[PDB]
Amino acid sequence: VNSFSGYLKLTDNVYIKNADIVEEAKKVKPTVVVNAANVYLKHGGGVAGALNKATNNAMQVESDDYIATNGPLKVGGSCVLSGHNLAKHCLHVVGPNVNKGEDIQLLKSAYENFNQHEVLLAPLLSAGIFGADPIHSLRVCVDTVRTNVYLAVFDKNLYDKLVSSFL
Numbered sequence: 400v401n402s403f404s405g406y407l408k409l410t411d412n413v414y415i416k417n418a419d420i421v422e423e424a425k426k427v428k429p430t431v432v433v434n435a436a437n438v439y440l441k442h443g444g445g446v447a448g449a450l451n452k453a454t455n456n457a458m459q460v461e462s463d464d465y466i467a468t469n470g471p472l473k474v475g476g477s478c479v480l481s482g483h484n485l486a487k488h489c490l491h492v493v494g495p496n497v498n499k500g501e502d503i504q505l506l507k508s509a510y511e512n513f514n515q516h517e518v519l520l521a522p523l524l525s526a527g528i529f530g531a532d533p534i535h536s537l538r539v540c541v542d543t544v545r546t547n548v549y550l551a552v553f554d555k556n557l558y559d560k561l562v563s564s565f566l
């Protein structure tokens with residue numbers, strides 16, 4: 400039993416809700432919140448910009464030190480950093496950004512990072528400003544993640560289509 404509330408159950412391990420991940424993380428304070436990151440950990444817009452703003456830029460400060468030490472992530476890769484005031488940990492995961500011409504096949508690799516954590520609050524990878532088809536992202540999530548994932552979906556209208564078309 401966990402403290403997530405109001406989610407629709409899609410499969411044995413995937414749950415979905417129309418919600419603002421910033422507000423959800425502040426309420427639940429989950430062990431792991433997933434950020435829709437880029438390889439440079441520049442949290443400018445989308446989920447990343449919103450999560451970073453909610454940390455008063457502490458996420459960006461920590462991320463800049465991470466990159467200065469380690470260099471950029473790989474597309475499809477991840478790193479674990481602090482969750483600041485939002486969660487215990489933040490798993491920064493880089494899905495492919497179609498608006499940069501990146502290979503959508505890397506979306507499965509991106510979701511594989513979730514399997515290293517028993518329970519996660521997460522957005523749909525490569526959706527929103529990353530330019531992939533969200534119906535595809537949900538399908539890859541369900542077919543790749545085996546741990547317990549609570550998906551927040553920003554747009555109330557978007558959410559209804561994913562549910563109604565969910566196979």
Ligand SMILES: OC[C@H](Cc1ccc(I)cc1)Nc1ncnc2[nH]ccc12
Pocket residue numbers: 418419420421435445446449522523524525526527528533551552553554557
């Ligand atoms: O897949 C991630 C999703 C992308 C998306 C945005 C808008 C439309 I229209 C269609 C897709 N963005 C978010 N999901 C959950 N919480 C969020 N907080 C801030 C942004 C955000």
Ligand SMILES: [Cl-]
Pocket residue numbers: 444445446526527528529
């Ligand atoms: Cl977005």
